[PDB]
Design a protein around this ligand. Structure first.
Ligand SMILES: O=P(O)(O)O[C@H]1[C@H](OP(=O)(O)O)[C@@H](OP(=O)(O)O)[C@H](OP(=O)(O)O)[C@@H](OP(=O)(O)O)[C@H]1OP(=O)(O)O
Ligand SMILES: [Zn+2]
Length: 378
């Protein structure tokens, strides 16, 4: 149960070598960012990060993102303008940080011929852009992701974080529908567990809907845990529970990344979990520190990771991409929600995912109130 589970796809690095390297690189970068772990912000329960490799040489690995955090937003603090982070579990934050890197990389491709050489993207013959060959991303988490991977209840079942609650709880037998006004009045906000979000990324990709208008689906090649690694539980949680998925749109797949623990596993530590979450993306001068309860920084400023900020980045790319090179038509992007819906193939993939969970007996995905996404840029 402690042996690595091979990827069912490509695998270009020795598993245990890759696992130890990515875990070392993420920890090292986090130390660098926290003044050799001396910052108040070095205090963490869970550390996560993303490492990129190019080709076969593990020496070339580059840390893309580093994050911490174990909490989510208080329901009263939901933003209807995209200004608040909903979910500050480290692994979730590390993906959003990766998104910024992806926007930057598209901008390098689009800027000019010289910046273009540095980009990890190439033109796709199918339209838009795709990764250069053998560019891979690897997810590191210092412990097993919450929900199905950690809890071992029913094997593979969907589970939610619940506001101000520890751990996760099963999804109900009848599909739960959240409402803006119900949450404001005191219904506790539910957020899908990290196990469930990563399984989601193993179908719809890590890039999200908006980025899929520009690029082909991108998947993690590896998921590396720094503690509580159990191959069989993790393989079920990360993909196998939804092997029943069908009718995926073009380029989507049920991704089955390498799964591995590390040679020197961490221990469970005592202490109250920090209420904050650190994030950093390669290229950033410093970490950003977010209060998990409000989803904003300590001064009430919006995160560089918030919906609004990501949409700002997306809009900037949208103005640079010739219409005929988009993967999905979107002439005059306005409301955030509607722009996401323009990613038609991604939405179809998401629907196949939701159906897979339901049909497998694992419950129904619990979505946010729609009002979160009903905003435009000024
Ligand atoms: O990083 P996450 O916290 O997991 O955020 C995601 C993400 O939303 P944003 O990128 O707008 O913050 C998803 O968007 P996609 O790129 O996958 O489209 C969205 O899914 P929808 O597209 O269905 O809105 C999902 O929202 P939901 O909770 O309704 O599943 C939401 O997760 P959180 O709401 O938990 O932040
Ligand atoms: Zn989690």
């Amino acid at each position: 149960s402690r042996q690595p589970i091979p990827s069912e796809g490509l695998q270009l690095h020795l598993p245990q070598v890759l696992a130890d390297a990515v875990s070392r690189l993420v920890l090292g970068k986090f130390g660098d960012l926290t003044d050799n772990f001396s910052s108040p912000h070095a205090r963490r329960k869970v550390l996560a990060g993303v490492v990129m490799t190019t080709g076969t040489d593990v020496k070339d690995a580059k840390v893309i993102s580093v994050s911490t955090g174990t909490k989510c937003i208080n329901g009263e603090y939901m933003s209807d303008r995209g200004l608040a982070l909903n979910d500050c579990h480290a692994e979730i934050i590390s993906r959003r940080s990766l998104l910024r890197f992806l926007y930057t990389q598209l901008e390098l491709y689009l800027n000019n011929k010289d910046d273009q050489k540095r980009s990890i993207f190439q033109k796709s013959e199918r339209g838009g852009f795709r990764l250069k060959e053998n560019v891979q991303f690897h997810l590191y988490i210092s412990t097993s992701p919450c929900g199905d991977a950690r809890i071992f209840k029913a094997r593979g079942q969907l589970r939610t974080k619940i506001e101000s609650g520890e751990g996760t709880i099963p999804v109900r037998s009848n599909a739960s529908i959240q409402t803006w006004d119900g949450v404001l009045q005191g219904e506790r906000l539910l957020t899908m567990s990290c196990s469930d979000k990563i399984a989601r990324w193993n179908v719809v990709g890590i890039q999200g809907s908006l980025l899929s208008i520009f690029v082909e689906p991108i998947y993690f090649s590896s998921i590396i845990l720094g503690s509580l690694y159990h191959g069989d539980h993790l393989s079920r949680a990360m993909y196998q529970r939804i092997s029943n998925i069908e009718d995926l749109p073009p380029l989507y797949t049920l991704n089955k990344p390498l799964l591995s623990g590390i040679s020197n596993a961490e221990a469970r530590q005592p202490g109250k979990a920090p209420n904050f979450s650190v994030n950093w993306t390669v290229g950033d001068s410093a970490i950003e520190v977010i209060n998990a309860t409000t989803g904003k920084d300590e001064l009430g400023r919006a995160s560089r990771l918030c919906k609004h900020a990501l949409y700002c980045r997306w809009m900037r790319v949208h103005g640079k991409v010739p219409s005929h090179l988009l993967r999905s038509k979107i002439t005059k992007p306005n409301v955030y929600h509607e722009s996401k819906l323009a990613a038609k193939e991604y939405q179809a993939a998401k629907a196949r995912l939701f159906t897979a969970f339901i049909k497998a007996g694992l419950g129904a995905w619990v979505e946010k109130p729609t009002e979160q996404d009903q905003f435009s840029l000024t």
